[PDB]
Write a protein that binds this ligand. Structure first.
Ligand SMILES: O=C(O)CNC(=O)C(=O)O
Ligand SMILES: O=C(O)CNC(=O)C(=O)O
Ligand SMILES: O=C(O)CNC(=O)C(=O)O
Ligand SMILES: O=C(O)CNC(=O)C(=O)O
Ligand SMILES: [Mn+2]
Ligand SMILES: [Mn+2]
Ligand SMILES: [Mn+2]
Ligand SMILES: [Mn+2]
Lengths: 457, 8, 459, 457, 459, 11, 11, 8
C-alpha cells in the first residue's frame, strides 16, 4: 500500500477533522516537522524535500487520469485545460476554441506544448479530498493545478505567483530553479508577475531535479521556472493557498468600518476641515514651508493612529471566515462521520421507502460533523450559520449557503461550534426549552451539519 | 500562469 | 443705498476675489469680527447678531421676488418648492404634483403652509453672487434655502441639519429656539436628523424673535425650530455650507490609498494572516483568554498607526479641491474683470459683419488668473488637468467636471499663475521651453475665460 | 408693422388654437393656398415661394439676437451651436470644447465657418411661439435650426434630411440647389444621408438665390446645398417636422400587438410549425423546388394578411398622440386665454396674498385651454390625461406629464376634448354627481388645462 | 432483453440519425403508425396507447435510479426536485431550501408528497439519449420531467401545459383524467395555465388507469390530472416538446424585419401619416362616422397585407434553426460514428508517451457530417457561421451558442455536406478553390467532431 | 400554489 | 413627514 | 446636419 493510500486509510480512522488536516499536512512535508516549517520556512524561504520514495504520491493523480479526463469528462480549453510552450524567451499559448479532446490535447503535447489543468479537484475526487482536508489546516482556500510537460521542453516563462506554492512531483523528472525575491517590493507579492526574460533573473537560490515523490515549496514573490531534460516528461501537482490573506487585506476591510465608527463615536472625527487648507495642501504646495501644513499632516497621523481603538476586528474576522466558508470545498466525510450523519441514514427505496422516520431525542449525543464546515456570523441584526456541506467542487459555482439561527438557540449554536469534537447530549443544551433544543439539533442534523454518537433509529 | 481560482 | 447694495458696490471695487469673499463675510456677521467668529463661535456655539438695521438685506431677496418667480419661472413643486406645515407635533408635507403656480402656492400659504424655495440661487442672480462669493472664503460649497412662513404658524418640526447655518431675516419676524446638541453623538452630527417632538427637546440655549436684518448662526447638530406669532409672516434665507467637510470624511479617502500604498511599499503589510486566527478572533470569542488574541489586536493597532506614514495627503487634498471646483457655482465677475477678460471683448455683430475682430495675446501681455477660486491643477496618472468653475451651472451638478489637460511643458507656468494671484505676469516671462509654449498656454487660458490681461487687447 | 408682428397680433385675436395654427401656416406659405400645398406639394415636390417682401420675417430672428444669445444665455458648443465649413469637397467641423463665447464664435465665422444653432426655440421665445403654433397644424413636432453663413463660403456638404424642411431666408442672399430623390430608395428617406460629393449629384430641380422673406420647402430625400456669393452673408431658419411619422412607423407599432392579439383570439396562429420545416426553409434551400416550401410561403402571406383584422389601430393611434403630447412644446397662450385661466388669476402678493380663493361653480362656463395641449389615453386598466402645459422648450427635458382620470369623469373628460372651443357649463357635465363635475373642472383648471368664459372671483 | 434495450441496440445498428429518430418515435407510439399520429392525433386529440407489456420502458428510468441520484448527485430542491401535494383542492409546494437528501425527499414522500425531478436528462444518460434522439424527429427541443407519486394521493392540481406531452408510465399505476380545451382560447394555449379547481372542469374526454408500458399523449391546452388510488405508487416520465414553436411565434420574428424591409424597399411605407389623423383615430373615436377613418383602417389592412411580399422567411427559418441548435442536447453517438470520428481516435496516453499519434485527413478521405441534426449553417452580416450541438451541455442553455466561421471559399462545400448526409464525399471532390481549401475545411470539421470518415484514419 | 411541468429545465 | 434644509440643491 | 432634436 502506497504511503498516500496508507495515510488516507489512516485519516479515515481519526475522529477530529482538525487532527486529520494536521496529520495530512504532516504527511505532505515529512520528515520535516510542521512546527519547524511554519516557524522558519513558511513565507520565508524556498524548501525542497527529498522524499526518496517514488511511490509517495501514488494514487493522487497520474497522466492516465488526465487522459481519462479528456475522454469522459467535458474538459474545456481555457476554462479547464491550458496548453503553452516557452521558446526563444517568449511565452506562447496554443489554445484552440472549444472542447479539449484527447486527439487535440496530445497533438499539442507531441508538438512540445505543456498542459495545465486548472481545476483538478473538480474532476479527481482524490485531489478534492486532499485539498478539502489540507485547507482546514491552512485556514485558507487550498487551490491546485496540474502541469504536464513533454520531454526536452519548457512550458512556462520565468515568473512568480501570488500564492504559497507546494509543488508535488508526480511522474518523470524536472529541472527547477527558484529565485528569492529580486527586490523588496516583490517579497510576498500581492499579485502574480508578468513573464520574465532570463535577463531579469539573478542566481537561483535553489536548482534541483525534482524526482517523483519529492516536494518543493516556495513563497509568493519567488520567481521560478522548470524544464524537462533529455528522455523523460514531467507531471506535477502544484498545491496553492493563501491568496490575498495578508494583514493588508484585513486592514482594507477594517479601515472603512473604523473611520465610520469613529465619526459616530468621537466628535474629533466630525470636526470640519480648515476653511483654507487647499491653499497649503496638495501636490502644488508639496514644497511649501507653511507651518499649517505640518500641523495638518500631524493631525492626520494622530487621527489615523486613533483608529485602532475603533477597529471592528472581530467583525471583519467573521466576514473573512464567512468568505472562507464560501471559498471552501465541500467536506470529505470519513466512514464513521457518514454512518453517524444524515448522509448515512439507512433510508432508501426497497416497493416503498424503508427505514424512514429517524428521530433525534433529548438523549441523543451530538456534535458538529467536522470543525471547518460551519461558521456563525452576525449580519444586520440577525445571526446566520454559514456552512460548506452544500458547496460545489468548483470555486463559487454555488453561492453563500446559510440558515438563520434564532437567539433562543444562539448560545447552543455557539457551544456546539466550540465543544467539537465533544459529544453533547441534546437534552442538556443552553436553550430556553426542549422545543428549542430539538429544533436546532434537528435543523442542523437534517442539514448534514451534525452527527450523533449512535446511528439514529 | 498558476490560477488559484478553479474556473473563471 | 441699502448696506447690501453698498457692500456689493464695494466688492466690485476690490481687485482680489479672495479679499471680496472675506470682505463680504465681514459684512455678513458685522459688527462681529470674522477672526473672533471662526476662532470661538464657528462649529462651537449658536450666535445671534441683532443688526438694528431693517434695511441690511435689502436687495437680496423679497417675497415679491418669490411671487414673480413662481409666475415667470418654471418652479416645480418638490423639485424647487416645498410647502409644509407643522401641527399637533406632526410634520406634514402637502406637495401638489407638478408646477407650482402662484395660485396654488398662495393657496397653500393661505391654508397655513410654509413655502421653502430650495434652489434660490438658480432663479435669483443676486442670491447667486452672494453665495458665489461666500463659497470662496468658506472653501466649501455654499448653498441656501428661502423660507416663507405665514402668520401664527410653524412650517417645520424641530430638528437639526447636517450643515453650518446662517439664518438671515429678510421680512417680518419669527420666534426662534435653538438648542445645544442633546447628546455627544449629536454634536456636529454627520447627517440631518428626523423630525423631533417637543418631548425630545430640553431648554433652549437661545430663544429670540429675529427682526429683518438680523443673523442667527448655529452649527450642525444644534436642534432648532421657528414660528410666527403676531399677525405677521416671516421670510428668511438660510445660507448653509460645510456638508461632509469633516476630518472623518478626509480620512475616508485617505485610508484605502494608505493601506494600498502601505502594502505595495512595506512587506509587513504583505505578510500572511495567522492560519488559525479564526480560532480566537470573532464575535463568539470576544471574551477568550487566548494570548494570541491580545497579540492580534496589538498587531492591528500597530499597523493602523503605521498607516500615517503612507497617507497620500496631497492627493486627497487635490481630489477634494477638484470636487469643490465641481460643486462650485460659476464666478460672478467684477466689471473690471469682465472688461479685461475674454467675456468683455468688444467683438460683436453689427451691421452686416463682426466688428472689432482680432484681439491677440502677446508676449508683452501682463496676465493673471481671472480669479483665485475658479481653477485648480490636479494630476492623475501622468496626466495633468486644470479644472475650472467658469462653465458651471447655477444648478448644483447640472453640468459635469469641466477641465482641460496641461502638458508638462506648461506645468510650471500653470502652477505659477495659480500662486501668483493677483500679481500680473508678463506672458513672455512664463517658465516654459519655447515662446510658442507661453502663448499657447496664455491663449488657451484667456479664450477659456480663466485669465485676464492687465490691459484690454486690441491687436 | 411687419407682416409677422401683424400676423401675430392677428393670431392673438383668434379664439381657436386650431384656427390660429391654420392661419399661421397660411401666412407662412402665402400667397400659395394651404390646400393646394398639402394636396400637390407636401412630400411630393420642392417649392420656392418668392415673397417679394424683405420684411416678411422681420421680428422672427436676426443675427443680433444670436449675438445677444452668445453673450447672455449659456450657449454651448456641440450641445447648441455648431461651426462648420465646406472646402475641397470635404465637410469639416471646427468645434472647440466648452462654451460658445462671442469672441470664439465670431472668430470661426470670420474664418469662413458657418454657425448652426440647434435649439432656437429654447432661447428665442418668438421662434418658440412660431414652432409651438405651427406644430398644432402639422400634428407633429415642429423642430428648427438657424444657419448663419459668412460671405463667399459654403458651410455644409450636399446631403438630404429625414424631415420635411421649410427654409426661411432671414437676412442676406444665398444660392440654393435642390435635387429630386436620386434613386427610388431615397424618396422620402427614413434617415438623414451622409455628406455627398459633387459627383453624386444630378441636375438641380431647383436653383435660386433666396432673398430675405422668401420660403423654400423640400421633402425628406431631396438633396440640397447652399452657398453665399460675393459681398453678403446669409441667415435662415429651417423649420423641420414629420420625423419618423410615416405609415411604416405606425406599422412598427401595430404589428407586434397584432400578432399577439391574433395568437390569443385565433387558434390558427397557435398551431405548431412543421416538424421538419428546417429541411426546406432557409437560405440554404432558397433554391429548392420542394412544394412544401411554396406551401409555407403561402401560409405565411395568408396569415400576415389576416393580421389587419387584429390590428389595434386606435390604440397605437393614441400611443402616438401620447408621444406627440410628450414631444410638443409648451403652448403659447393668447392674452384672452391667459386672463381666463389659472395663469391669469389676479392672485398675487400685495403684505399678504390678495385676491386668493377663486372658486369654480356649477354655473361656470368652461372649455379646454387649447386643442393641442391634452390627450386622453388608456394604459393598463386606467385612463390618463397627458398634457403639454408643463413641457420644457427643450425636447424631452421633462418627462410625460399626466393625471389619472377616474371613470366617473371619463365621459366628461371625453366631452371637453371634443366640444372645443365650445363653452360648457360645468353643472351640465356627463358625470354621476356634482362632486364629480366640480372636482374634474377644478382639477383641470388648477392644472392650467381649462379656461372659463368669465374670469373667476 | 427489454423492448427498450432492443430498440436502443437497434438504433446503434442504424447509420442515419434521421432514421434513428424516426424509428425511435415509431417505437414510442407503437403499434400506432407515426404517419397516422402526426396527421390525425398530433395537436388535435388526446391519445392513449395501452401497451400490454409492462417491460416496455425497462431500462429508461426507475424509482431506484431516483434514489441513487438523490444520493450520488447534487440534487437541489426547487432547482432539480419539486415536492408537492394536492389536498382540499389546493396546490401546495413544500420545497425545503437546499440539497434534496434522500432522507428529506423520502420523508416528504412518506408524508404524501409527490416528487418531480425537473431535469432527468442531466443526471440520467439513458434518458438523455432518449430525448437527444427524439428531438431530431421533433424538430424542436425535447425535454422531460419525472413524477413520483405515493399511494392514495395527488401531487398536482388539474391544469394544462404549454407543451405537447407524452406521458410514459414506468412503475405502478395511476388514474388519469384528460379534458378537451374548455374554451376556444384554451385550445393549443400559448402559456401554462394556473391551478384549476374541479369546479372549472367539465367531463373527461378520457379517464383511465395507466399501466407500466402505456403511453398517454395530449396537446397543450388539454387540462389533466392524475392520482394514485390503491396502495400502489406511480412513476412516470413526461416527455414534452413544441414550446413556443407555433406560427404566431414565427410571425413575431418576421413582421419587424418585414415592415423594416418594406420601408426601405417601398415608398408607400415611407409616406407620412395624415396631419390630423388623431382627430378621427383613437379610443375616444371608435364610433366616429368620419369617412377618413374607414379609409385609415383600409390603408392599414392594405399595407399589412403587402407585408407578405417583404417577409424574410429564410432568414427567420435559419434563426429559429440556430436557436434550435442552441437548445439542443448533445448528440448521442453510435459505436460506429464514434470509432469513425475524432472521438474514437485510438490516440491516448500509455507508458510514458502518447500512442498512435498522427491521424491525418487526406484528399482521398471519404467523409460526411457526423449526424444530420448537429449543425446548421447561418449567415449574418456578410459572415457565415456553422453552429453545432456537439459541445452543448445536457443542461439546457448551460453553455452558449457555439459556432465557427465559414469563409466564402468553403460555403459551397459546407452547404454540400449539410445536404449530402449520409452520403460519403471524397474530400478531394469538395467544391472549393484549392486543395488547401478542402483539407482545411475537412480538417477543421473533423477535429471539431462534426465529421466522420468512411474509414478510420491512421496516416 | 406551485407550478407544473417545467419544460425548459433552467430551472 | 417631509425633510428639512436641502443643501445640495439637486434636488 | 439638420438635427430635428433640440438637444442630444
Ligand atoms: O512547470 C512549469 O513549466 C511551470 N510550473 C509552475 O509555474 C508552477 O508549478 O507553479
Ligand atoms: O423656518 C423654519 O420653520 C425652519 N427653518 C429652518 O429649519 C432653517 O432655516 O434651517
Ligand atoms: O445653409 C447651408 O449651408 C445648409 N443648410 C441646410 O442644410 C438646411 O437648412 O437644411
Ligand atoms: O402526475 C401528476 O399528478 C401530474 N402530471 C403532469 O401534470 C404531467 O405529467 O404533465
Ligand atoms: Mn508558477
Ligand atoms: Mn402537466
Ligand atoms: Mn433647519
Ligand atoms: Mn439640410
Amino acid at each position: 500500500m502506497s504511503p498516500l493510500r496508507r495515510v488516507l486509510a489512516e485519516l479515515n480512522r481519526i475522529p477530529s477533522s482538525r487532527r486529520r488536516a494536521a496529520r495530512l499536512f504532516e504527511w505532505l512535508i515529512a520528515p520535516m516537522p510542521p512546527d519547524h516549517f511554519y516557524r522558519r520556512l513558511w513565507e520565508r524561504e524556498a524548501v525542497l524535500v527529498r522524499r526518496q520514495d517514488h511511490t509517495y504520491y501514488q494514487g493522487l493523480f497520474s497522466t492516465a487520469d488526465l487522459d481519462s479526463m479528456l475522454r469522459n469528462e467535458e474538459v474545456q480549453f481555457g476554462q479547464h485545460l491550458d496548453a503553452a510552450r516557452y521558446i526563444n524567451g517568449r511565452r506562447e499559448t496554443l489554445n484552440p476554441p472549444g472542447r479539449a479532446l484527447p486527439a487535440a490535447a496530445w497533438s499539442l503535447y507531441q508538438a512540445g506544448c505543456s498542459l495545465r489543468l486548472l481545476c483538478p479537484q473538480a474532476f479527481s475526487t482524490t485531489v478534492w479530498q486532499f485539498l478539502a482536508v489540507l485547507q482546514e489546516q491552512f485556514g485558507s482556500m487550498a487551490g491546485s493545478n496540474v502541469y504536464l510537460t513533454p520531454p526536452n521542453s519548457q512550458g512556462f516563462a520565468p515568473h512568480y505567483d501570488d500564492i504559497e506554492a507546494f509543488v508535488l512531483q508526480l511522474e518523470g523528472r524536472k529541472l527547477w530553479r527558484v529565485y528569492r525575491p529580486r527586490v523588496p517590493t516583490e517579497e510576498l507579492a500581492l499579485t502574480s508577475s508578468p513573464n520574465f526574460s532570463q535577463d531579469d533573473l539573478g542566481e537561483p537560490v535553489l536548482q534541483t531535479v525534482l524526482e517523483p515523490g519529492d516536494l518543493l515549496y516556495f513563497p509568493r514573490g519567488f520567481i521560478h521556472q522548470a524544464e524537462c531534460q533529455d528522455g523523460v516528461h514531467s507531471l506535477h501537482l502544484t498545491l496553492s493557498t493563501y491568496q490575498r490573506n495578508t494583514w493588508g487585506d484585513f486592514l482594507e476591510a477594517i479601515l472603512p468600518l473604523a473611520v465610520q465608527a469613529a465619526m459616530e463615536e468621537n466628535v474629533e472625527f466630525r470636526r470640519g476641515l480648515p476653511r483654507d487648507f487647499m491653499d497649503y495642501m496638495g501636490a502644488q504646495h508639496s514644497d511649501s514651508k507653511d507651518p499649517r501644513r505640518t500641523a495638518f499632516m500631524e493631525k492626520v497621523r494622530v487621527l489615523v493612529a486613533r483608529l485602532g481603538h475603533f477597529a471592528p476586528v472581530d467583525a471583519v474576522a467573521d466576514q473573512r471566515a464567512k468568505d472562507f466558508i464560501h471559498d471552501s470545498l465541500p467536506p470529505v466525510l470519513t466512514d464513521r462521520e457518514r454512518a453517524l450523519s444524515v448522509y448515512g441514514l439507512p433510508i432508501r427505496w426497497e416497493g416503498e421507502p424503508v427505514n424512514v422516520g429517524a428521530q433525534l431525542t433529548t438523549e441523543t449525543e451530538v456534535h458538529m460533523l467536522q470543525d471547518g464546515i460551519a461558521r456563525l456570523v452576525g449580519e444586520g441584526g440577525h445571526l446566520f450559520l454559514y456552512y460548506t456541506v452544500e458547496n460545489s467542487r468548483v470555486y463559487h459555482l454555488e453561492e453563500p449557503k446559510c440558515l438563520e439561527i434564532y437567539p433562543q438557540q444562539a448560545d447552543a449554536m455557539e457551544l456546539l461550534l466550540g465543544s467539537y469534537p465533544e459529544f453533547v447530549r441534546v437534552g442538556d443544551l443552553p436553550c430556553d426549552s426542549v422545543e428549542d433544543q430539538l429544533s436546532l439539533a434537528t435543523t442542523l442534523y437534517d442539514k448534514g451539519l451534525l452527527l450523533t454518537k449512535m446511528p439514529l433509529a | 500562469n498558476h490560477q488559484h481560482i478553479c474556473k473563471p
